[PDB]
Amino acid sequence: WXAXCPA
Amino acid sequence: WXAXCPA
Amino acid sequence: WXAXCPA
Amino acid sequence: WXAXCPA
Amino acid sequence: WXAXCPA
Amino acid sequence: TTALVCDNGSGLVKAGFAGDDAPRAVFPSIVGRPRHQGVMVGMGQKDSYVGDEAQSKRGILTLKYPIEHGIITNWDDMEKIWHHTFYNELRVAPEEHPTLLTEAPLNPKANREKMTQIMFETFNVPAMYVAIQAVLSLYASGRTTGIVLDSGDGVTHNVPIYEGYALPHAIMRLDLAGRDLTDYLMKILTERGYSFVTTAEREIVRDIKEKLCYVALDFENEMATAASSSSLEKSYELPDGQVITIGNERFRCPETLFQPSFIGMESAGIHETTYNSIMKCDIDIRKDLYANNVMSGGTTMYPGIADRMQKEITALAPSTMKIKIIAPPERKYSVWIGGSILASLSTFQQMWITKQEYDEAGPSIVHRKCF
Amino acid sequence: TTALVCDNGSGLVKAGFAGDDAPRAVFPSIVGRPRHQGVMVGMGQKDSYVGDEAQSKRGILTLKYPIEHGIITNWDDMEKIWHHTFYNELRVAPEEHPTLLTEAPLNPKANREKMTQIMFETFNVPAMYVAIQAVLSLYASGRTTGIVLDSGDGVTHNVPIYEGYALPHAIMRLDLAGRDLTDYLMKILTERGYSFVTTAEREIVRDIKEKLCYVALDFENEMATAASSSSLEKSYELPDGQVITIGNERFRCPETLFQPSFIGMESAGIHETTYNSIMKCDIDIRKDLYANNVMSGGTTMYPGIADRMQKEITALAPSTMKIKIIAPPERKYSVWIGGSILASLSTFQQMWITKQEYDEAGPSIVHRKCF
Amino acid sequence: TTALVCDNGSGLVKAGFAGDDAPRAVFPSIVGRPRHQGVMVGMGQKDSYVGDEAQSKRGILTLKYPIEHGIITNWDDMEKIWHHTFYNELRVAPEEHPTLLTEAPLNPKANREKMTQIMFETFNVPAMYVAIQAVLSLYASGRTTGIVLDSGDGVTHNVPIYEGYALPHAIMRLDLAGRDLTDYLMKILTERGYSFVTTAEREIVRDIKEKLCYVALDFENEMATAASSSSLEKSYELPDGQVITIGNERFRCPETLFQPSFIGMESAGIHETTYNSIMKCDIDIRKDLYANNVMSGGTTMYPGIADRMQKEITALAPSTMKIKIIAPPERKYSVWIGGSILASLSTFQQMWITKQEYDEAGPSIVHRKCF
Amino acid sequence: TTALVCDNGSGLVKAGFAGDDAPRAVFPSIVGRPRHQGVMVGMGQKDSYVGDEAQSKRGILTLKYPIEHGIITNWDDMEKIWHHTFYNELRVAPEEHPTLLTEAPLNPKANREKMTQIMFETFNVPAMYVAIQAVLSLYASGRTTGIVLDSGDGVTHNVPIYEGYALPHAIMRLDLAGRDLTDYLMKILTERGYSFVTTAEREIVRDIKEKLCYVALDFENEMATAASSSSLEKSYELPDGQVITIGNERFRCPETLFQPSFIGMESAGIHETTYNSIMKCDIDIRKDLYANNVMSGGTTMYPGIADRMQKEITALAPSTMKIKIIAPPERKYSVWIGGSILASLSTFQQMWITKQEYDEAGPSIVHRKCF
Amino acid sequence: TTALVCDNGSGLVKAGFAGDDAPRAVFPSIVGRPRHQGVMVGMGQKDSYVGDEAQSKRGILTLKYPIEHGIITNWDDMEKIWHHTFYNELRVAPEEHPTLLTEAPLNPKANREKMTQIMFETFNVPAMYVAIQAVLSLYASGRTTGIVLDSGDGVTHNVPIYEGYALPHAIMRLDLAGRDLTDYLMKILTERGYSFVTTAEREIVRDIKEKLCYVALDFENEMATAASSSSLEKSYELPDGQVITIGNERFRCPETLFQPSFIGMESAGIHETTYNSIMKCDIDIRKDLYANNVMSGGTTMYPGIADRMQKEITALAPSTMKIKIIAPPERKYSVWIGGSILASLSTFQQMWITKQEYDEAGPSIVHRKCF
Ligand SMILES: Nc1ncnc2c1ncn2[C@@H]1O[C@H](COP(=O)(O)OP(=O)(O)O)[C@@H](O)[C@H]1O
Ligand SMILES: Nc1ncnc2c1ncn2[C@@H]1O[C@H](COP(=O)(O)OP(=O)(O)O)[C@@H](O)[C@H]1O
Ligand SMILES: Nc1ncnc2c1ncn2[C@@H]1O[C@H](COP(=O)(O)OP(=O)(O)O)[C@@H](O)[C@H]1O
Ligand SMILES: Nc1ncnc2c1ncn2[C@@H]1O[C@H](COP(=O)(O)OP(=O)(O)O)[C@@H](O)[C@H]1O
Ligand SMILES: Nc1ncnc2c1ncn2[C@@H]1O[C@H](COP(=O)(O)OP(=O)(O)O)[C@@H](O)[C@H]1O
Ligand SMILES: [Mg+2]
Ligand SMILES: [Mg+2]
Ligand SMILES: [Mg+2]
Ligand SMILES: [Mg+2]
Ligand SMILES: [Mg+2]
């Protein structure tokens, strides 16, 4: 992901 | 009646 | 009223 | 209804 | 809640 | 074959056959029609009801009386009632028997004439005769001398007869009668919160009148008694289960016959018209009339009316004169009974007006009085 | 000091002082109580509202009328209204002035008796007198001869007077009145999808009636006109901003006065009871009555009702007879005005029933009519 | 060929053929549409569901009732239901048979008019007729005299009939009905933590009501009993397996019919409107009505409602009056049955409104009442 | 001594003393417990954190809300929060002061009952009273007539009051509230690659919502604007220094209040429930309600929500009706303020439920409403 | 010509042609590059390896997964894998066939958008469509109603569908999946002296997991059993011939799905999210969902996971509710199979997004859902 978690 | 009183 | 009609 | 109450 | 919805 | 008698008085129809000791068919002269809504003409409904039918279902009917003050006002309905009698109450063919009708004295000539036209047109009455109600009453008493006070619903009248000779100059008539008493009562009941205004309600009032009213001997003292707490009040249960209490109306109503001014009339009281009628007659008759006052008709059915009249006339008449009020148990049917008797007499037979004569001589024949 | 007049009719209270040319306090005879929830008795709430108070807040109140058909049914509330008048509307001490009350004819005796008991107990009215509404109306017109049709909300009545002599035998009364017209209208509005069922909603209907209804000259042709596309429809804005359209109800409603059968009553139309009342009266009066028909009361406020009645009576009456309908701009207050006049008269003064007399003679005194 | 009857009341559709002793197709008047997401129009989905279809899949549908308080509000959906009936439930061609419809009294004229337009346009009904539900109920009982309390889901009404003559002046109507009882119950269940808010959930509440509610004979004492630890509580298993316990709601709900104030209405209780309706009627009818109270409709299916009403009226009515509540095992289908009977009558036949007449005379014909 | 007010709504606790113009202690209704590892019970650790403590250290805590949709689900934690208030935030002895609590309308009876049990057991509150949040809001406005839309985090409700008389039949409630808006936002942020899933992360989303969301006047056109390149996007810096960009979510979120279908609910929008509630009320009230819409609660804090509602109601209401949205600068604390006022009133004093009464009468007393 | 399906899930690529009963090409979603030294660019070396190539030579490669948690993080490598598929594994020209892709629900919009850009740019796919993995799984089962738990390597998700109507409001997602289980196992193996830290070593751990792990029915008792000397330990031979012994890790690993707290997550266990998802759905659906739990995805391949879930849900659900876990032999390929079916449907055909449309309408089209 972009915010929260990686991906 | 016709004149005086109804009947 | 008392008898006939309400009032 | 139209006036008073819904229906 | 108890029935319907959680709470 | 067997002459029949039809005392179709103004308000109640009493019919039967001559020779019988009582009427065979007695029912109200009422025609009723659906009030609240028109008739479902393509379905099992009924346009009008007559007599007891109408009375029984009066809650949804507008009731009318074809006859008012002894005068037929609605011929269509009158006709209908006669139809009802012959085919529903007596259930006989009218063309098979002579018809004795009754009539109050001093009516429009056209009243009588139209009745006979119908009897010789709508019906095919072989022969018929119209007689005065008071006269017939006297025959029922079987007395040859007296003065008769016949007071029905629509009309009150007074006819003196001496030794079998009618005195057709002192016949008196009032339109004051049972119908007015009913109306008056109905009105004054308003004072106690009892409202009766519909025609059906009127009918109820009539019943009340007949069961609770009585004639006070001394009206003024009776009022004083009623004013004090007393036992004069009576209860009455209305058709719907309600109970009403009637007080001094129990005599303020019938009192009107002795004081017509209560309803705005100039007429003298019935005790005064009786007295006056006697005064109009020859002094050598008077005594016999005083001892033979014959009362008849439903409005003389009130408890104590004879006693009241006894008192009233006594006051008006000479102190050496014996006043006697005759008031048989059967006053209600006196006229009809008289008709039964008269119709069965062998000499009477010659007075029947035949259809033949009617057709030949014409309508004027109905006023003949050859006897 | 200054006699005051209280035309506490069945539906609207019109009070003021004698000598004034108009009522001082006019407000509905309504007592209203909180509908949806009981009253917060320990907080700033109010148990009941009266007149304009109740009307103003009617959305949350159940409204009642203490008086029905001219008979007081709820004495507690009646008392409350009188209280409201004296202390909130006129704001005077009742023990300082004579009180002229009005009453519809033919009420239960107890109605009058109880009112006077209150006036001489709850209040301390020096002296008082109860008069018939129609009679007072005639005084307002200032005419000595005529027949008065007073038709308010709870009751309609008809009283003939000739040359200053009342004719207390042809007084007629119907319980058909403005209240029934309101109810009827309310009912038939259902046809257009307008539902009014609560008491507050009833009040709205009343307003509509008063503003849009009129009396058709020829009802049947008026119906035909309404059936076709036309200008008869009118709009009306309801309190919440909605707009409703009224069509033929604008005359199907008031028509009921001429055809009582619409609501299931046997009563003759008001034009027929007028006519009949005249027929019940002496032939030498009749002519004068025909030329002096005085209408009064709020239900005669409909546009063209006079013209309609003119037409209706004309048909019933003789062709050589002049029919004249009198219908002053101020019909609505006719009775009150009449009271003002009467109370101010020097001869009238001797008829006041004093508390002293009430206490001595007792309740029966309220029915005296010595004049 | 064979007239069919469609009691499309507000809430439940009961249709079948005349002559049958029971409806052929009974299903809810419900149209349901996908709630959570729009329809996959290019795939095997279905835009809407009707009756049992909708009810079965209600978990994902928003359910609507085309009819509210006896008034059709959504014609598109109404039309759809009629379609569903003819082609899915009865599966017959509507143009082959006469159609007898039912209707609650006192509706907007346009309701009826629009229905007939559809029946003579969307459908090609040969001929049709619209009858009042309560009237038909009386035919089912086979009694000629009585007063009918028909209380369905959307509307409650009361119609007195005497000896085959309808009394169209004392017809009363309340919009208080089963729908409101359902809503009320649904609301008060909140007290026990049971929340039902969606339309589908409403449907569940309806079921509960029908199975657990009963009418307390003495509400106040019943409350006291419920307050104490008792056996009044009942269990009920919800569709998802959960079990709920219902206590005093088992009678606080149906009680509303006797105390409309619970939901903010000014309406008198049904026992009072029954009584009052009788009071509005002629005194010579009253007795017969008291002995013939006919109840019909699904909201009269509550255990002991007859006994409760028996008690309530007994208190209001005279002590000498016999009160009799008639409540047949089949109240639920009374109206439909009545329709079956009426449609099969030989005289009834002449009242069918033909398409021909509709086209010629026009829409106004639907309000005729010649019979 | 000095009554205190505790608006322990579902989500945020606002407490203070009556007479103060603002709450003294405002902190989240949150209890947090160590997530990643159990507590070192023999060392200086802390089992749980409350309010701002928990929020401050939320990175290692699992946060829970004792109250959901206005219903207390976790009594142990609820108790703990009240403890925290009295001893850490206000730092007063609870047995020294009366306690005014607030509550959303239509809760399980047990909710209230259990709270009072605690207040008279765990604590020793002298006396207490539970009031409806919307009602109190109206007191804060100081208006006697209006309709209140109180929409907090766990619950939204709507209460009409007319002239100081509550209308307890049109109280409506939705479980749609700020909590759902938060959740929804959190979900749709996924579209931009922003993942928030932990409870602590939820808390962050809440903050974002409060700072960037606004209510579009015309949602559809607002979407079109957002679709085009525009200035609607805003930046926001996350706790760890990252910056995120919010686009059309800035209004797609709060829009849900006007279109509940976004989250799968059948509920009408808040502008529709407002309107409908008014329609359920008596026509003579409606106008006043339209001009007095009072909004309160944190979810009404969105920029332009008043304008949006103004528009929405305007469309639904009659064109001649004046719609007025009241939305004071202090909506967030309206309820608390109302409590301050009420508690300080001299008449209010008589409604306190004492421990004495609780012990004597028992738990049922908490539902009294004598006022 | 023949639509092809590419279930390019996060971790394993399963591709084939529609109509086939099994995937044609199945290989890891891995791109590997030389670790120890740069590439001899002027000699016969190879810069990168894909799928089985990389796996086979992993000893000298650093392996990467382009896709993480269902989100493509490395587009260059993703592109490379698609290339590898089309030209090395299927060996077909991509421009000749429609492409059905799969995707986990709730991804950044840009994920989908970028994929389609590539498919219409790097490749020249005629038309394509992106579908949700769980939905397709349901098609494979052939059931129209159920709830699907699809749990792959990078992501776990849960989608309820009722009677062919998706319920897009209760879709849940966890990033907890097979990848995390692998990592966790890898970590806890440290306890026995087994160190796996390189990417290639990770791959080995994956294999172990798949062969020795199973789901304990009763975890706590299983632990007790493992604590005692037992037969739970299993041997496993590593690639280099060494043999390792696995004990309680054989179930402490997969247990994490039921207790996410093991790896520091707040997520509820998969049995709880299943249950909760059902609770979020309408009560009339719930029953059907309980009897149709469909599991799919490689992480549901553990021995006894169905039995464990059966137990767990049974405890949470009502005792009268029938819980049924559906877990077909082919769970591993369920999604791909579903794709095969869907692609072959005649109605599906209309949903293909053509290049033409993409070019005209633009990227936003990929989120359409007309069906
Ligand atoms: N017992 C009674 N008491 C008083 N009036 C009676 C009684 N019976 C009948 N009547 C009255 O007599 C009238 C009818 O009797 P009747 O003399 O036969 O009338 P008519 O001769 O006019 O037909 C009615 O006015 C009726 O009320
Ligand atoms: N302009 C009007 N048109 C029609 N009816 C009216 C009008 N004004 C008043 N009314 C009706 O008159 C009645 C009240 O007037 P009023 O005669 O004073 O009543 P009451 O004398 O019974 O108090 C009500 O029925 C009211 O609707
Ligand atoms: N056994 C029952 N107990 C209580 N209410 C019932 C029962 N059966 C049906 N109902 C109610 O009756 C209504 C429907 O019945 P019905 O009279 O046919 O309605 P309608 O005539 O309006 O179509 C609904 O309100 C339903 O809940
Ligand atoms: N400025 C704001 N804008 C939008 N929402 C807000 C704002 N301030 C508070 N809220 C929301 O209001 C709710 C809490 O406010 P409040 O009305 O006090 O809740 P409650 O009364 O339920 O305790 C939360 O949902 C919070 O996000
Ligand atoms: N027999 C098995 N037992 C346990 N896990 C397995 C088994 N087979 C495959 N897996 C796991 O399933 C995941 C890959 O399967 P799959 O569901 O196709 O993944 P995706 O759908 O994400 O491509 C990996 O985490 C793999 O370890
Ligand atoms: Mg006689
Ligand atoms: Mg008047
Ligand atoms: Mg019904
Ligand atoms: Mg709040
Ligand atoms: Mg998968």
Side-chain angles (χ1 to χ4, degrees), chain I residues 183-194 248-253, chain J residues 106 109:
Chain I
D183 192 74
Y184 179 75
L185 176 60
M186 182 181 73
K187 180 179 178 181
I188 65 172
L189 290 174
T190 299
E191 292 172 2
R192 288 176 177 264
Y194 301 142
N248 66 18
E249 303 85 10
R250 293 184 68 202
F251 61 87
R252 288 168 63 196
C253 173
Chain J
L106 302 176
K109 287 174 69 178

Side-chain angles (χ1 to χ4, degrees), chain H residues 12-313:
Chain H
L12 181 66
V13 178
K14 302 184 300 293
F17 288 90
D20 290 340
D21 64 0
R24 186 175 296 274
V26 178
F27 63 94
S29 180
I30 298 173
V31 177
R33 293 179 172 86
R35 180 177 67 208
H36 290 292
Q37 186 177 8
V39 176
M40 299 183 182
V41 297
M43 299 181 73
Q45 300 294 343
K46 185 173 179 178
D47 288 345
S48 66
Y49 297 85
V50 178
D52 289 349
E53 291 175 334
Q55 188 180 61
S56 295
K57 297 188 192 305
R58 69 192 183 216
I60 60 170
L61 303 174
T62 299
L63 307 179
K64 300 292 184 183
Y65 292 88
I67 302 169
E68 180 176 283
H69 299 321
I71 299 170
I72 298 166
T73 63
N74 183 329
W75 289 105
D76 291 346
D77 289 350
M78 188 70 255
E79 184 180 53
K80 183 178 288 182
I81 291 170
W82 281 326
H83 175 84
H84 180 80
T85 299
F86 293 153
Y87 297 106
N88 295 326
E89 297 291 337
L90 298 178
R91 300 181 295 279
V92 299
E95 66 274 25
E96 295 179 355
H97 305 282
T99 299
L100 178 63
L101 301 179
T102 65
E103 191 180 18
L106 302 176
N107 284 337
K109 287 174 69 178
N111 188 65
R112 181 179 298 183
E113 291 174 13
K114 182 60 66 174
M115 290 191 288
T116 61
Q117 182 179 17
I118 291 168
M119 292 297 179
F120 294 123
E121 290 295 340
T122 297
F123 302 99
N124 298 287
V125 176
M128 66 182 293
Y129 181 75
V130 179
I132 300 300
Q133 289 176 313
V135 172
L136 292 174
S137 179
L138 185 60
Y139 278 100
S141 71
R143 304 180 75 79
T144 61
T145 299
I147 183 167
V148 178
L149 178 61
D150 182 357
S151 178
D153 187 67
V155 63
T156 298
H157 64 278
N158 184 313
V159 179
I161 299 173
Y162 187 70
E163 300 288 291
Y165 293 88
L167 303 175
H169 301 284
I171 296 171
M172 295 181 70
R173 174 177 166 160
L174 300 174
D175 289 341
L176 177 64
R179 184 68 61 85
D180 296 300
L181 292 174
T182 297
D183 192 73
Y184 179 75
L185 176 60
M186 182 181 73
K187 180 179 178 181
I188 65 172
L189 290 174
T190 299
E191 292 172 2
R192 288 176 177 263
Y194 301 142
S195 174
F196 300 100
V197 297
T198 66
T199 303
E201 289 170 340
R202 184 185 298 277
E203 191 66 18
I204 292 168
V205 171
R206 180 186 61 76
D207 189 65
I208 292 168
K209 183 187 73 175
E210 293 178 8
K211 292 176 178 170
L212 299 178
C213 294
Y214 67 94
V215 178
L217 181 60
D218 179 335
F219 179 78
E220 184 64 22
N221 286 338
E222 194 69 7
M223 287 295 291
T225 297
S228 71
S229 177
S230 73
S231 65
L232 291 176
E233 288 185 339
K234 296 290 184 182
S235 66
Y236 179 87
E237 183 178 6
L238 296 176
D240 67 359
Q242 293 186 79
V243 177
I244 61 172
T245 300
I246 306 300
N248 65 18
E249 303 85 10
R250 293 184 68 202
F251 61 87
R252 288 168 63 196
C253 173
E255 181 66 18
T256 301
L257 292 174
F258 296 91
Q259 298 185 62
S261 68
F262 285 172
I263 61 168
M265 291 180 67
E266 293 184 5
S267 175
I270 63 174
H271 64 293
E272 292 174 318
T273 61
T274 298
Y275 176 77
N276 286 342
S277 180
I278 292 169
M279 294 300 96
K280 291 179 181 179
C281 296
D282 193 299
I283 193 170
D284 289 315
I285 295 170
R286 290 181 180 179
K287 181 176 179 180
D288 289 341
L289 293 176
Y290 281 126
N292 292 275
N293 295 295
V294 178
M295 299 179 76
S296 68
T299 63
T300 66
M301 292 295 289
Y302 294 105
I305 196 168
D307 290 344
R308 175 65 180 276
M309 187 171 291
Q310 179 72 44
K311 177 179 170 64
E312 290 293 350
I313 293 170

Side-chain angles (χ1 to χ4, degrees), chain G residues 7 9 14 133 150-153 155 157 296-298 332 335:
Chain G
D7 186 20
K14 302 184 300 293
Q133 289 176 313
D150 182 357
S151 178
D153 187 67
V155 64
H157 64 278
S296 68
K332 184 174 179 179
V335 172

Side-chain angles (χ1 to χ4, degrees), chain G residues 46 49 57-58 237 240, chain I residues 163-165 169 284 286 320:
Chain G
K46 185 172 179 178
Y49 297 85
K57 297 188 192 305
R58 69 192 183 216
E237 183 178 6
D240 68 359
Chain I
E163 300 288 291
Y165 293 88
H169 301 284
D284 289 315
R286 290 181 180 179
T320 63

